[PDB]
Amino acid sequence: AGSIPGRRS
Amino acid sequence: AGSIPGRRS
Amino acid sequence: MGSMERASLIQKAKLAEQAERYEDMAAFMKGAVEKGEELSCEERNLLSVAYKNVVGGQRAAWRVLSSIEQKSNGPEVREYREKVETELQGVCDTVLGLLDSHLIKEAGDAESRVFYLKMKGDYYRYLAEVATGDDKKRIIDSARSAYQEAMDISKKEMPPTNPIRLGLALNFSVFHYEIANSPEEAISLAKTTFDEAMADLHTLSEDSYKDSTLIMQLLRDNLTLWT
Amino acid sequence: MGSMERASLIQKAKLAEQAERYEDMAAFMKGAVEKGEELSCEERNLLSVAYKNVVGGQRAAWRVLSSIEQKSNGPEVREYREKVETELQGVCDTVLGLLDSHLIKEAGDAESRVFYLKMKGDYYRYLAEVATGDDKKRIIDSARSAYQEAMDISKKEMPPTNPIRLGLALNFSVFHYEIANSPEEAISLAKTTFDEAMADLHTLSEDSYKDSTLIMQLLRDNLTLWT
Ligand SMILES: *Cc1ccc(S(=O)(=O)N2CCOc3ccc(F)cc32)cc1
Ligand SMILES: *Cc1ccc(S(=O)(=O)N2CCOc3ccc(F)cc32)cc1
Ligand SMILES: [Cl-]
Ligand SMILES: [Cl-]
Ligand SMILES: [Mg+2]
Ligand SMILES: [Mg+2]
Numbered sequence: 362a363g364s365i366p367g368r369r370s
Numbered sequence: 371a372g373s374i375p376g377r378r379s
Numbered sequence: 380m381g382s383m384e385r386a387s388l389i390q391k392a393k394l395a396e397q398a399e400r401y402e403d404m405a406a407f408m409k410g411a412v413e414k415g416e417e418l419s420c421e422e423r424n425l426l427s428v429a430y431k432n433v434v435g436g437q438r439a440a441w442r443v444l445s446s447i448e449q450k451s452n453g454p455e456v457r458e459y460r461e462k463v464e465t466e467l468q469g470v471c472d473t474v475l476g477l478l479d480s481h482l483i484k485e486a487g488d489a490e491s492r493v494f495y496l497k498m499k500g501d502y503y504r505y506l507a508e509v510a511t512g513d514d515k516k517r518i519i520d521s522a523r524s525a526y527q528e529a530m531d532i533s534k535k536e537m538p539p540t541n542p543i544r545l546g547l548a549l550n551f552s553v554f555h556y557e558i559a560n561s562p563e564e565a566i567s568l569a570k571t572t573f574d575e576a577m578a579d580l581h582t583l584s585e586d587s588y589k590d591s592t593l594i595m596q597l598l599r600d601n602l603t604l605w606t
Numbered sequence: 607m608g609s610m611e612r613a614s615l616i617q618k619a620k621l622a623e624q625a626e627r628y629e630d631m632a633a634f635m636k637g638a639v640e641k642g643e644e645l646s647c648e649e650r651n652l653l654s655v656a657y658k659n660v661v662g663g664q665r666a667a668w669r670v671l672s673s674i675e676q677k678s679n680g681p682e683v684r685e686y687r688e689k690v691e692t693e694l695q696g697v698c699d700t701v702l703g704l705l706d707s708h709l710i711k712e713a714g715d716a717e718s719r720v721f722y723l724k725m726k727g728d729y730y731r732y733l734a735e736v737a738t739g740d741d742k743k744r745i746i747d748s749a750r751s752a753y754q755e756a757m758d759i760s761k762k763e764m765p766p767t768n769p770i771r772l773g774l775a776l777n778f779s780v781f782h783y784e785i786a787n788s789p790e791e792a793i794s795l796a797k798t799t800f801d802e803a804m805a806d807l808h809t810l811s812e813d814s815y816k817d818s819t820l821i822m823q824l825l826r827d828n829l830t831l832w833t
Contacts, residue, residue, distance in 0.1 A: 365776055373550045455621070
């Protein structure tokens with residue numbers, strides 16, 4: 362599914 | 371303001 | 380792209396658009412133009428979409444950097460704005476070079492010739508957005524001249540609802556407002572274009588009506604912002 | 607970038623992020639790493655953001671093209687998918703090369719070493735997404751090994767709410783589900799991570815709580831999709 366984004370947004 | 375887009379969308 | 384078939388370049392430009400790979404798209408379409416044959420309606424649109432998206436991203440980045448630079452006033456912000464600016468100018472020069480060698484001179488039908496002269500006006504306009512001083516003057520005049528020739532042909536050869544004629548008027552009106560310091564000319568052009576198109580909608584099919592009214596709404600959106 | 611100061615490269619990477627120029631960002635951060643000094647926390651984040659955005663765009667384009675190719679089954683779709691795939695592999699190889707020369711070997715603190723080993727797992731995972739056959743096997747194992755070393759350090763040296771530990775667990779769980787064909791391992795890891803973080807939230811400040819709960823929600827979103 363989703364992995365960690367580059368920034369909190 | 372806005373110019374013409376590349377596609378109708 | 381000299382070793383790739385024209386038809387393969389066109390096919391890959393369409394794939395690149397679907398994949399949102401606009402730099403690739405533009406490179407494929409540059410290769411297609413350089414084959415030396417005229418472009419069909421659909422191929423002209425692929426060329427324009429590709430470069431409009433590439434230069435549109437550069438313009439947005441240049442505006443971010445230009446804003447930071449103006450607020451700041453080390454060399455880094457200016458150096459990086461200059462780097463983006465040089466890249467943008469290079470893309471505009473490339474497009475103008477394709478139009479000059481030899482798309483415009485071979486374009487005899489009103490639809491093709493107006494399309495290319497509108498592009499020429501647009502890429503000189505993008506150069507004018509980043510130009511200063513006297514360079515600005517000759518660049519601004521080059522945009523004006525291209526748009527004016529396109530307008531003259533469009534008014535003689537196309538109905539007032541034709542989408543190319545409408546988009547040309549829209550962009551020339553933006554030129555007047557944002558580049559030429561002529562907001563009244565911009566408003567006048569947008570109003571007269573809108574009204575003349577309105578009066579011709581009765582002649583159109585449902586699908587043509589949808590196209591013409593879409594661009595009329597863009598003219599109206601600008602008029603609402605400017606008035 | 608050898609002639610630009612380290613501090614100027616870092617400054618320009620920050621400007622590039624603001625301008626959404628991620629290829630530039632990545633080039634500036636590659637130049638900064640190649641100066642040979644260790645990276646601070648903030649600098650590690652700039653490196654990761656830059657390359658995650660570049661490779662993220664390549665992955666999205668590869669998936670569009672791979673879908674078109676599978677539906678089709680001339681050479682153009684396969685050729686263009688291959689071109690995008692080679693570019694993607696080249697970016698992953700570049701990042702892995704920075705980690706191997708010499709970011710990981712100089713990283714002694716748990717925060718830095720876990721961060722870089724998580725990156726190593728991620729870029730081998732991106733290589734595994736496009737790999738076939740036996741190449742796939744050794745690439746998959748390389749991702750697994752990097753994530754496992756990062757997990758072992760994180761569990762010994764970081765609290766269960768630490769955002770790097772949480773993001774590592776999130777990404778390793780995605781590896782299990784999407785790459786390793788181990789959905790039960792993926793679900794187990796995400797659940798145990800979420801629950802152990804929940805039990806440690808009471809120790810955190812308001813700002814740390816916000817960070818930890820944000821990543822816990824990402825774990826929960828995956829669990830909801832997978833169950
Ligand atoms: C300059 C220009 C104007 C119009 C066209 S189009 O008719 O092919 N087209 C594509 C571009 O965006 C559009 C918006 C609305 C519309 F009705 C048609 C278009 C192409 C170039
Ligand atoms: C791999 C990784 C995990 C966490 C961070 S961070 O703490 O610096 N950060 C930035 C990345 O996205 C985030 C989402 C949510 C959050 F709370 C923090 C972060 C960096 C790298
Ligand atoms: Cl001709
Ligand atoms: Cl060290
Ligand atoms: Mg041929
Ligand atoms: Mg120095």
